[PDB]
Amino acid sequence: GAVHGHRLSTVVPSSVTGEVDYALADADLAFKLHYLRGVYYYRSGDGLATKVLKDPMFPWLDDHFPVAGRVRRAEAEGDGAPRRPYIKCNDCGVRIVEARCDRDMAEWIRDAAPGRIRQLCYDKVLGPELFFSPLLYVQITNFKCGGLALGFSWAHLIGDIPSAATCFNKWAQILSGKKPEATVLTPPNQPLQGQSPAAPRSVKQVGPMEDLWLVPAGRDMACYSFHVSDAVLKKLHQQQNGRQDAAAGTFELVSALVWQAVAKIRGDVDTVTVVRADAAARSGKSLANEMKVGYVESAGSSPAKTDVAELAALLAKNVVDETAAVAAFQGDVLVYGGANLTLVDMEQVDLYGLEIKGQRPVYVEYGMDGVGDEGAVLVQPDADGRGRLVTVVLPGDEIDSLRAALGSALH
């Protein structure tokens, strides 16, 4: 009942780009150890053989030619204590895996075992051959009923979650016959005179590994997905009575609910970071990790016995943003679970904008690879936009206990 027949391929830019050095920014290299794992389910894949899904990728990669590039390294000024990487824009391409599944797709949507995102999207990283590792992978599975599951394996080095979701929208628009927006990538990034010796409280400076940009697991991290309905956030709105409301009800109480769920299984969950996927902080939205990294301390109230609205007000209005300190730090960062449990707010993105012909996706979930040693949650909107969808990536020992410690509030 697993996927098989992994036929690999490569789609390249349709035009020669010449010698180009897309120089990565400081925040580009601060997020290099993480990997977006995103799949997009569809109720029908008729008329969608893997030549009409691959032929729009040649004009799509013309506008996004650093995605088809490869990582190289330059030389330092004096002795080579740093070696700043850059995406060499040779037309080296991105992998197109064409798998197939024999199980029914709808019964795989109704699943509790955390093995969906690891199976349905191709699990490679910027691996041991760092100079020959693609920055994007597409897995196109076909089910027994006839569904379609476009699974994108995006590398967080080149661009973040808005710059990944809109980049996939810009391919679905070419597939739908539309004309996408012309993407800027024109102002070249420059190294800032930083070196940031005051280390952030959101990070954990790992050892400077050479050619494997994937901090190893240690634990047994797995990507479990659960959907939260629209009526549950109404129950998250009938608790903050008699006081002022500064919690953004679309994300903040949803994060505090799973924070309270983790604060019955794990004791030391005191410090917690967030990474704000804000659209207003997209100053020159080209392809860049424009996340807002900020940690939240709970100095007086422990989160294990405190109500979810109080944790919501603690996380929302009391944040210490350090998104420039993580950029100015000298690499090897691992912000997705370095010291604290991370909460990602990627709900503002047009996640269901992967219209192939006129087909809205029926389920869109994201997962992460290279998550740190405390875990991560990934809130994201559902198909109708009423409720939310949370894919939590726990160390794996706490998955089945979260099924009991969380199902009481959902039921």
Binding site: T10, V11, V16, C92, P134
Partner: protein, 427 residues
Amino acid sequence: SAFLVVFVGTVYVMSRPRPVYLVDYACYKPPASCRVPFATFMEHTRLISDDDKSVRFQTRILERSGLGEDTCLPPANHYIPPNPSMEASRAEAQLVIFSAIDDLVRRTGLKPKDIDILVVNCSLFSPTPSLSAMIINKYKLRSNIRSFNLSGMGCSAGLISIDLARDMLQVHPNSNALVVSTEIITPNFYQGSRRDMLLPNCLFRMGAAAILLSNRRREARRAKYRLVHVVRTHKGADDRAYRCVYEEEDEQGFSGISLSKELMAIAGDALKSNITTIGPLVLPMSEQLLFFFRLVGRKLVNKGWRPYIPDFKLAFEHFCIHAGGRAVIDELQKNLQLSPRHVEASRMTLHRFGNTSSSSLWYELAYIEAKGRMRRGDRVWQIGFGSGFKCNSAVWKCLRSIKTPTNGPWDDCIHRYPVDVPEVVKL
């Protein structure tokens, strides 16, 4: 009387050979969705072969090969690993042939029932029924058509087909000959690890050409070139030249083309043996008489003076050297003392399209047409060498000047050529 000029008149006319005109030709332009750069070729080699000895060789070859970034492989070598079947190679023969004849039929007004001679050649791929019978089934050609399929003759069968369509048009009057020169490189991919059999993997790219030749007197106002000479030189009697380019099977059982180490010492001496049997034909008398007056000077004075080489720059204006590799073009520039303008067609065909087929000469001819350098009464030399070391040559003469928009295979990139082609690709 009055019969004093008839018997030196119409007796000579009935001994005159029929002229063969090149009406028009259509080269196949591969789409940009099938292009293979240097980097993805390297990343495809170091994913199916775990030995880093047959990969560091591919690096040096494709670096110093002179192939650019727009060279195209069929949609079976884009997979990791390639899955070359018969259906994926036959349906790739129906792409490069049927969209090169359709580019020729729509530009000449040629009818399918006006085809009397069909000469197709393709070295490695030879299915059953033939590649000519595929064209006869698709385009619905006649029942009494002279169809020939010259398979196995290597990369120099592009002019063997030209000579065969030349000689078939002397026997049959008022006929049109169709010449298709291809290389279906889906089964021409080497699956092993031997170093000598890995050089056709780096150089062989896609390409085709559909040629229309005729002997009709009406095709003298519309035609482009008239066929002057076709000179064939087969050095296959030597044992070094026969087994130089050899289709072996390696120790694991993977077929492929095994180039020998002394490839340039044979291709320089199977070609300079072709220059001497074309010197009397194409040179002026002022070059020939000076040449053997200097050749008799090394017969009675001493055993060899300084060898005077006949100028072919005074014999031709356009040279189409076969784009086999970079190391053949730069030494033929050394012997024949050609300018970089003369070897510009072969270098830019090797850079844009790669070592395509037996039909790289037609992409070179489309280059020197598309730049507008093909005037009226210009003489074109098409040197082509292959396997068995047949080294055929052909001489054309232009009948009408070709305009600059030629709608061939060069149109989108002719304003960016020629480019500086470096010695090593910096990687």
